[PDB]
């Protein structure tokens, strides 16, 4: 889905539309022998919230060879820790140190 | 009896997982393990293909 720069100036105050953002972190680069390019893509919109919110990990592919690809995250040391019950009634952590 | 709450076999949970695969990134090494090595750590492997 693609929107226009004229509709972004006439949209009603309380009507929330969705506009998708392209990731494209893992994408194989072109081969050595292929036609070149001439003055390409111009991007017009940018989020400043910022949007990156819910991600356990991202791009689980290995970059050649034993290293992480640039800008890849792993799961946090919190969703991998089963604690113990309280001295009475609810869940507590490890704890630390 | 009054029976306020009903019982269930397995719990659900409020927070679940989602994924977006890339159907062109396949490793050429078909690994293998035992059956009890499979069961405990099984469906979690097929959520992080």
């Amino acid at each position: 889905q693609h929107v226009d720069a004229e509709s972004i100036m006439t949209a009603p105050k309380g009507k929330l539309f969705h506009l998708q953002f392209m990731d494209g972190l893992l994408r194989p680069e072109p081969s050595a022998f292929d036609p070149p390019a001439s003055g390409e893509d111009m991007r017009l919109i940018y989020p400043l919230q910022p949007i990156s919110v819910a991600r356990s990990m991202r791009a689980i592919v290995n970059h050649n060879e034993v290293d992480r690809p640039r800008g890849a995250v792993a799961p946090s040391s919190y969703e991998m820790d089963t604690g113990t019950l309280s001295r009475n009634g609810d869940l507590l952590y490890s704890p630390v140190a | 009896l009054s029976d306020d709450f009903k019982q269930i076999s397995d719990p659900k949970g409020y927070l679940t997982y989602s994924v977006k695969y890339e159907d062109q990134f396949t490793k050429k090494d078909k690994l293998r393990a035992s059956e009890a090595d499979d069961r405990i750590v099984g469906p979690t492997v097929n959520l992080f293909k």
């Binding site: 194989p28 592919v61 290995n62 970059h63 060879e65 | 990134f25 050429k28």
Partner: peptide
């Protein structure tokens, strides 16, 4: 079962030309 015999074998060799794959490996 009746008469004791003798057989022979030779380890086989199997190879095909390197096939083409369309799937990529690393980033």
């Amino acid at each position: 079962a009746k008469i004791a015999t003798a057989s022979s074998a030779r380890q086989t060799d199997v190879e095909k030309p390197a096939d083409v794959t369309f799937t990529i490996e690393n980033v």
